[PDB]
Amino acid sequence: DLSTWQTFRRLWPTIAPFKAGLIVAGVALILNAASDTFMLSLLKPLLDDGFGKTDRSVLVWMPLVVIGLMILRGITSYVSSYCISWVSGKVVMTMRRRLFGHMMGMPVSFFDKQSTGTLLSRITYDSEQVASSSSGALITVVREGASIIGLFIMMFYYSWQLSIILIVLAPIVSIAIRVVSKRFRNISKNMQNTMGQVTTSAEQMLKGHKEVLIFGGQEVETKRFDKVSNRMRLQGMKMVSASSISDPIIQLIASLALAFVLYAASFPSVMDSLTAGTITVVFSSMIALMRPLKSLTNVNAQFQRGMAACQTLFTILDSEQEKDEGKRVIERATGDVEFRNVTFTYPGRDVPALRNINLKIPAGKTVALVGRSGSGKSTIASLITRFYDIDEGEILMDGHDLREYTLASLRNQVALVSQNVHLFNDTVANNIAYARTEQYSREQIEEAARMAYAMDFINKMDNGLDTVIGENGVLLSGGQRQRIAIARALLRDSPILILDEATSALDTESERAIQAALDELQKNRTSLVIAHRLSTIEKADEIVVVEDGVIVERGTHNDLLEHRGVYAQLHKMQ
Amino acid sequence: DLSTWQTFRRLWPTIAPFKAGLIVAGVALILNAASDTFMLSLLKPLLDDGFGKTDRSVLVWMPLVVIGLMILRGITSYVSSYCISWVSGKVVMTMRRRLFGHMMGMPVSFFDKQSTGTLLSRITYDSEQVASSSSGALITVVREGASIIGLFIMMFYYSWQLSIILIVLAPIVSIAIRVVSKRFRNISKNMQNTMGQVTTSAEQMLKGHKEVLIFGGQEVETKRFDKVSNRMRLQGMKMVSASSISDPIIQLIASLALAFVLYAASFPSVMDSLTAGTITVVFSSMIALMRPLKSLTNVNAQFQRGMAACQTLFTILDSEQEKDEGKRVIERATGDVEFRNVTFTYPGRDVPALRNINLKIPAGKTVALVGRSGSGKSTIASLITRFYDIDEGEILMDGHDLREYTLASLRNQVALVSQNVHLFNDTVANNIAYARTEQYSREQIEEAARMAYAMDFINKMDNGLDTVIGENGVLLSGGQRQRIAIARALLRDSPILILDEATSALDTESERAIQAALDELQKNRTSLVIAHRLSTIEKADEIVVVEDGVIVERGTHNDLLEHRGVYAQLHKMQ
Ligand SMILES: Nc1ncnc2c1ncn2[C@@H]1O[C@H](COP(=O)(O)OP(=O)(O)O)[C@@H](O)[C@H]1O
Ligand SMILES: Nc1ncnc2c1ncn2[C@@H]1O[C@H](COP(=O)(O)OP(=O)(O)O)[C@@H](O)[C@H]1O
Ligand code: VO4
Ligand code: VO4
Ligand SMILES: [Mg+2]
Ligand SMILES: [Mg+2]
């Protein structure tokens, strides 16, 4: 928990580029406060010198001065507000952009334990609270502070004897504001966590909607959301209770100043040194000082909430991202990947998921990983992509350990068809050519799609390649969204290709056409196809059988089949 | 785009139950306004008496009554603020609950075109805007309104020769506030869509993270989020420009009243009967009225934003939900299902996916759907669940149409495991027994896992049945996720079981084991098995071969094999 001025010194490097746009705002605020103070001091001359027997010596030129002062105040307030809001908007943009670009680079080990709801709350709630507090509440806070300091200097100018009490009452209000702002920040952080839970529940509902319908998850989801929204309301209630018990207390404490000055001025031995105008302007200033104080202490809730959000985001932005310890970069790999004594236990587990693998993938060939449905088959594919780091043992690419290569230059050498195919809500062309859209002409996209037996059914759609695919490609069947992932992978010429259950959903002749396409196209590029259909693999250069997490049998189709090993029992039952 | 009072009169039925709090808050607010007005009026008695003609300076009671009046003001302010925030929190919570329970009732046809980011924005951002405006800004707006009304009353009580101008200028200030509130609402309703785009971009980055990593979608996603955040900040700056160009103008308009008052005092022949205290309390009243104008017109941004958000949510809450007509509840259906010339055209297409389907699924039988990847078979599975409505044709179920059956009593007769199956971020037991957590005991869940061959891996994890499966079950392999989905489907004893590729990602012998265990239930169950592995369904009661959109072949295994039809070719490719 950082104090509300510690957060600004933690934020200053972000604001520093725009400090030129803040000097004008500060000068405008100073002039605004001066104009308001001089306008309130204008009550002095129309009771002392203004009133006389048929006397309008100042009143003849008075209201025009009020209009001019009002115009000055208006333009200064406008420029101050707009420039402060511009700086706030730029800073909020920078924080939001950096936050998004940060969680976009965290390791997958982090994504496997955090619900989507909390991160979406980070993007769309905390940043929004910071923006709202620093655009709407900050201007009010700083302007009322300027007005208050102006009233202070004015009351000390006219009569110090009637304003020594403010020296004794400033510390009390400072302590009260500090001790209530701490509570505001704590409640705001708990409130942020509760919003995270709310959006997590909402996203679990939305993403798993069909199962909610089919299994009758009506009442349970409704009750869970009821409880979480109730917690949200209760924490908001605690914040409101703090605010509404801190406003009147401070207002009453600030009213001892007015009570004292009335008590002090009640002494005829003191009022002699002053006139009616000075006394009435002191009383008016003390009376009208309470309004800025009340407004500041009331708006202090939103400003403190924004400061809490900024503190949380700065803590998040200071986390550790994926280990990009790599130094060397490479353009195209020759196509050979080697394992050595590699073992790898998943984050937060006891038994290793691989005990020791000595797999060797030759350059420009294919290696297939058949085996049971619970062994390490997708784990190997994740490892050769550096999704997870090894525990011990060496994994090599082109004779140099896989940790020397930087992350970008490595994954730019591998194309993957995940068993859980995920497609973006965009046209078919942009799903096939996801990141390198500008580098691949529609001719290349069409060739890649025709390779993956997808152009046959794309033509049937409304706009051909231009059709929108839906939120997750739900507009297409599983065997039409597992042939766009294949097309996307085949579009690139990455020498290392992984087919993590490429044809799980396809029928037999469609996958036969796929296999023909790869056999006529992948004659030079290394592939790592993993599948339980032992007909997409009978042409592999070396079949590898992994069960329980350890390699058991390595060899060609013929050498394994006549060996009467585990592959023989796997093949004899198709 | 409705006005503020129209918004409240549209919202009043929601607010109606919570009227005691509103009434007591209103009474306390009137008392607070009277107390605050009475504090400014004390400036007259101390000048007509007291320091003016100090011969009666015996008046000493003023500080005591000031302190007492401020205590009363503080108490009334606290109770009014708290009992308005109670109604605000209750109403916002009810809006959240109604909105969540509403979108969870949308038909699937709506979910197949709307990105989840926008709906999460509706729940998270918009509702938060309503809550913030109605909690923080609303109390400020109403308090300043009360203070303004009190100051009008007091000044008109004192002297109307110097106050009839406020009759003239109130319409002008009202016109300005209305014509700036319209722009605030429009900008806010654009800002909601922009934030929806922000959160859609964020969500499409998170839940498609691996596709971002593999293909280098780093810079593309960075550009997209930069553009959307820039649009957001630009709209925010437009809002702030409107606010800070409407505030000083309205402030200056009110200044023409003060200048006129100061012009009236210059004329003695008419305004000779002004006491030295009456005039100086009218002037202080103008100043202390013009301050709340600034405060109210400044805080009007948040309040108008909240009203725009409440309007947007009220547009959602009266949209069309799922049809759900007919009130024929059924206890436990026999399971018989029949089609009659069914023709189905998907929402937004122009060629019928299904046409002229005659399908019978008699009780205690299994019907197998086979064909190319792209024919309509998952469509049939969706139709018998009533995810979509028939375009033209009759379904039947236990001797009656699916339309007459109410939806809640229809999905209880179907347990469906689909392709791309979803799992909830919760313990494995709470995933198997999803919505009936407190009906199926632990031994029943264990039996369900045992039937689906899932006990061999579910018993090796660290915590057994209680291990957290993570978001979408990413902590488990594809085969294990499929097995848990099967175990979830099998735990229910629903008459109809639909297996949309229930064994896509399982090795051959676990497929054999599951089918062997599933064969026990076929004595009473009525299952619809969709599968491309023809060895899975060689024992189907009747096999239905669905090509592009029409049932081509049907019969048993041997009848189709002897017929030398399309099934013969599909089987030769084994
Ligand atoms: N992200 C993960 N975190 C923890 N454990 C995992 C994870 N992924 C897989 N496992 C464990 O490793 C075993 C094998 O999974 P994996 O090799 O990734 O998939 P597959 O079995 O399809 O090859 C599974 O039984 C599972 O319990
Ligand atoms: N939600 C949807 N909206 C519009 N069209 C769809 C939707 N789901 C599937 N389709 C279309 O219906 C056609 C039939 O596919 P489908 O019957 O789902 O294949 P399968 O039954 O093998 O999954 C597909 O070509 C697809 O384009
Ligand atoms: O398009 V399919 O659901 O038959 O893989
Ligand atoms: O071991 V698997 O879940 O890819 O069939
Ligand atoms: Mg896998
Ligand atoms: Mg399907």
HEC string for A188-228: HHHHHHHHHHHHHHHHHHHHCHHHHHHCCCHHHHHHHHHHH
Determine how many CB atoms are found less than 10 A away from the CB of residue A210: 18
User: Among all chains, which residue has been given the structure tokens 């784990």?
Assistant: A379
The dihedral sign for the CA sequence A156, A158, A163, A169: negative
Determine how many CB atoms are found less than 10 A away from the CB of residue A352: 16
Beta strands at A496-500 and A526-530: parallel, antiparallel or unpaired: parallel
Residue A151, helix vs strand vs coil: helix
Residues of A in contact with B480 (CB under 8 A): 373-374
Task: Find how far residue A382's CA is from the centre of its chain.
Answer: 26
Angle subtended by helix axes B4-15 and B62-103, to nearest 10: 80
Point out which residues pair with B361 in neighbouring strands.
B337
Which residue from B13, B296, B92 is spatially nearest to B181, judged by alpha carbons?
A: B296
A136 secondary structure, DSSP code: I
Question: At A546, phi and psi to the nearest 5?
Answer: -115, 125
Do the Cβ atoms of A205 and A117 come closer than 8 Å?
A: no
Burial class of residue A183, CB neighbours in 10 A (0-12, 13-18, 19+): middle
Do the Cβ atoms of A120 and A203 come closer than 8 Å?
A: yes
Which residue from A303, A297, A315, A321 is spatially nearest to A11, judged by alpha carbons?
A: A315
Do the Cβ atoms of A427 and A469 come closer than 8 Å?
A: yes
Point out which residues pair with B543 in neighbouring strands.
B368, B555
Angle subtended by helix axes B62-103 and A218-265, to nearest 10: 170
A263 touching B (Cβ < 8 Å): yes
Q: How far is CA B212 from CA A413, B44, B471, in A?
A: 14, 73, 18
The rounded distance, in Å, linking the Cα atoms of A115 and A204 is 9
The rounded distance, in Å, linking the Cα atoms of B310 and B92 is 9
The rounded distance, in Å, linking the Cα atoms of B201 and B110 is 20
Residues of B in contact with A276 (CB under 8 A): 47, 51-52, 276
Residue A147, marked binder: no
> Entry resolution in angstroms?
3.5
Do the Cβ atoms of B499 and B529 come closer than 8 Å?
A: yes
Which residue from B122, B107, B126, B317 is spatially nearest to B200, judged by alpha carbons?
A: B122
Determine how many CB atoms are found less than 10 A away from the CB of residue A327: 9
Q: How far is CA B392 from CA B357, B379, B387, in A?
A: 11, 15, 15
Tell me the CA end-to-end span of chain A in Å, nearest whole number: 62
Q: What is the 3-state secondary structure (H, E, C) of A444-463?
A: HHHHHHHHCCCHHHHCCCCC
A476 sits in which H/E element: none
Residue type, B220: V
Do the Cβ atoms of A284 and A47 come closer than 8 Å?
A: no
The rounded distance, in Å, linking the Cα atoms of A65 and A49 is 17
The two three-digit tokens of residue A39, written as one number: 């306008």
Q: How far is CA B33 from CA A319, B44, B67, B142, B556, in A?
A: 50, 19, 16, 10, 86
The beta-carbon neighbor of B507 closest among A215, A372, A509 is: A372
Q: How far is CA A560 from CA A63, A339, A526, A570, B507, in A?
A: 104, 22, 22, 11, 18
User: Angle at Cα A257 formed by Cα A256 and Cα A263, nearest 5°?
Assistant: 85
Give nearest CA residue, ligand 1 atom 21.
A374
Q: Beta-strand (E) ranges in B391-484?
A: 392-397, 414-417
The rounded distance, in Å, linking the Cα atoms of B492 and B481 is 18
The rounded distance, in Å, linking the Cα atoms of A280 and A288 is 12
Sheet with A542-547, strands from edge to edge, namely: A414-417, A496-500, A526-530, A366-371, A542-547, A550-555
The rounded distance, in Å, linking the Cα atoms of A45 and A48 is 5
The two three-digit tokens of residue B82, written as one number: 């708290």
User: Angle at Cα B326 formed by Cα B323 and Cα B328, nearest 5°?
Assistant: 135
Residue type, B117: G
The rounded distance, in Å, linking the Cα atoms of B88 and A393 is 61
Residue type, A386: R
Beta strands at A550-555 and A542-547: parallel, antiparallel or unpaired: antiparallel
Buried b (16+ CB within 10 A) or exposed e, A211-237: bbbbbbbbebbeeebeebbebbbebbb
Residues 135-164 on B with a CB inside 8 Å of A are 135-136, 139-140
* Cα(B479) to centroid(ligand 4), Å: 5
The two three-digit tokens of residue B557, written as one number: 């295994």
The rounded distance, in Å, linking the Cα atoms of B224 and B204 is 11
Which residue from A453, A525, A531, A522 is spatially nearest to A496, judged by alpha carbons?
A: A525
Q: Which of A211, A300, A345 should one mutate to test binding to chain B, selecting the residue with the greatest count of B CBs within 10 A? A: A211
- The radius of gyration computed from the CA coordinates of chain A, to the nearest angstrom, equals 36
Do the Cβ atoms of B536 and B511 come closer than 8 Å?
A: yes
B126 secondary structure, DSSP code: I
Within 13 Å, how many C-alpha atoms sit on residue B25's CB side?
Answer: 19
The rounded distance, in Å, linking the Cα atoms of A108 and A416 is 16
Counting atoms of ligand 1 from 1, which one is nearest the CA of A382? 18
Structure method: cryo-EM
B127 sits in which H/E element: helix B127-132
Which residue from B271, B265, B258, B292 is spatially nearest to B37, judged by alpha carbons?
A: B292
* Residues sharing a CB contact under 8 Å with residue A192, sequence separation 6 or more, in sequence order: A121, A125, A126, A129, A308, A309, A312
Beta strands at A400-401 and A392-397: parallel, antiparallel or unpaired: antiparallel
The rounded distance, in Å, linking the Cα atoms of B336 and B525 is 10
Q: How far is CA B263 from CA A140, B169, B180, B259, B288, in A?
A: 32, 16, 30, 6, 19
Buried b (16+ CB within 10 A) or exposed e, A424-453: bbebbbbbbbbbeeeebeeeebbbbbebbb
The rounded distance, in Å, linking the Cα atoms of A183 and A244 is 13
B473 secondary structure, DSSP code: G
B320 sits in which H/E element: none
Residues of A in contact with B43 (CB under 8 A): 280, 283-284, 287
B225 touching A (Cβ < 8 Å): yes
B451 sits in which H/E element: helix B442-451
User: Among all chains, which residue has been given the structure tokens 């989840």?
Assistant: B116
Do the Cβ atoms of A522 and A359 come closer than 8 Å?
A: no
B357 sits in which H/E element: strand B354-357
The rounded distance, in Å, linking the Cα atoms of B315 and B193 is 14
A369 sits in which H/E element: strand A366-371
Could you tell me where the DSSP H helices lie in B207-277? Answer: 209-215, 218-265
A504 secondary structure, DSSP code: S
Residue A367, helix vs strand vs coil: strand
Is the CB of residue A74 below 6 angstroms from any atom belonging to ligand 2? no
* Residues sharing a CB contact under 8 Å with residue B105, sequence separation 6 or more, in sequence order: B321, B322
Point out which residues pair with B498 in neighbouring strands.
B416, B528
Give the CA-trace dihedral at B75, B81, B84, B88, to 10 degrees: -150
User: Among all chains, which residue has been given the structure tokens 């195209």?
Assistant: A332
> What is A337-572's CATH number?
3.40.50.300
User: Among all chains, which residue has been given the structure tokens 């009533």?
Assistant: B386
Tell me the CA end-to-end span of chain B in Å, nearest whole number: 63
Q: Beta-strand (E) ranges in A410-509?
A: 414-417, 496-500
The rounded distance, in Å, linking the Cα atoms of A58 and B344 is 88
Q: How far is CA A166 from CA A156, A158, A290, B401, in A?
A: 9, 14, 13, 82
* Residues sharing a CB contact under 8 Å with residue B466, sequence separation 6 or more, in sequence order: B427, B428, B429
Do the Cβ atoms of A225 and B97 come closer than 8 Å?
A: yes
The two three-digit tokens of residue B305, written as one number: 């934003």
What residues have their beta carbon closer than 5 A to ion ligand 5? A 378, 419; B 478
The beta-carbon neighbor of B221 closest among A104, A112, A488 is: A104
The two three-digit tokens of residue B107, written as one number: 């038909």
The rounded distance, in Å, linking the Cα atoms of B217 and B212 is 4
The rounded distance, in Å, linking the Cα atoms of A417 and A453 is 15
Beta strands at B360-361 and B496-500: parallel, antiparallel or unpaired: unpaired
* φ/ψ bin of B410: left (φ > 0), alpha (ψ from -120 to 50), beta (otherwise): alpha
The rounded distance, in Å, linking the Cα atoms of B67 and A169 is 15
The rounded distance, in Å, linking the Cα atoms of B295 and B303 is 12
The rounded distance, in Å, linking the Cα atoms of B396 and B404 is 10
B248 secondary structure, DSSP code: H
User: Among all chains, which residue has been given the structure tokens 């200056």?
Assistant: B252
The rounded distance, in Å, linking the Cα atoms of A503 and A530 is 10
Within 13 Å, how many C-alpha atoms sit on residue A466's CB side?
Answer: 2
Do the Cβ atoms of A392 and A341 come closer than 8 Å?
A: yes
Residue type, B279: I
Do the Cβ atoms of B494 and B414 come closer than 8 Å?
A: yes
Which residue from A241, A132, A140, A191 is spatially nearest to B302, judged by alpha carbons?
A: A132
Do the Cβ atoms of A214 and B415 come closer than 8 Å?
A: yes
The rounded distance, in Å, linking the Cα atoms of B447 and B491 is 8
User: Angle at Cα A102 formed by Cα A99 and Cα A106, nearest 5°?
Assistant: 140
The rounded distance, in Å, linking the Cα atoms of B492 and B451 is 12
Q: What is the DSSP string of A225-293?
A: HHHHHHHHHHHHHHHHHHHHHHHHHHHHHHHHHHHHHHHHHTSHHHHTTS-HHHHHHHHHHHHHHHHHH
* φ/ψ bin of A279: left (φ > 0), alpha (ψ from -120 to 50), beta (otherwise): alpha
Min CA distance, A422 vs chain B (Å)? 6
Do the Cβ atoms of A529 and A537 come closer than 8 Å?
A: yes
Min CA distance, B476 vs chain A (Å)? 9
> What is B337-573's CATH number?
3.40.50.300
Determine how many CB atoms are found less than 10 A away from the CB of residue B336: 18
Do the Cβ atoms of A133 and A306 come closer than 8 Å?
A: yes
Overall CATH class of domain B4-318: mainly alpha
Which residue from B152, B426, B344, B62 is spatially nearest to A217, judged by alpha carbons?
A: B426
Q: What is the CATH architecture of A5-318?
A: Up-down Bundle (1.20)
Q: How many helices (H) and strands (E) does chain B have?
A: 20, 10
Q: What is the largest CA-CA distance in chain A?
A: 127
Q: What is the DSSP string of A77-134?
A: HHHHHHHHHHHHHHHHHHHHHHHHHHHTSS-HHHHTTS-HHHHHHIIIIIHHHHHHII
Which residue from A105, A352, A283, A313 is spatially nearest to A192, judged by alpha carbons?
A: A313
Give nearest CA residue, ligand 2 atom 18.
A477
Give nearest CA residue, ligand 3 atom 3.
A478
Beta strands at A337-344 and A392-397: parallel, antiparallel or unpaired: antiparallel
Of A209, A453, A457, A475, the residue with max ligand 2 atoms within 8 A of its CB, to mutate for a pocket test, comes to A475
The rounded distance, in Å, linking the Cα atoms of A497 and B501 is 26
- For chain A, the domains span 5-318, 337-572
Which residue from A86, A342, A59, A305 is spatially nearest to A191, judged by alpha carbons?
A: A305
The rounded distance, in Å, linking the Cα atoms of A122 and A98 is 12
The two three-digit tokens of residue A295, written as one number: 């407004």
B60 secondary structure, DSSP code: -
Could you tell me where the DSSP H helices lie in B266-277? Answer: none
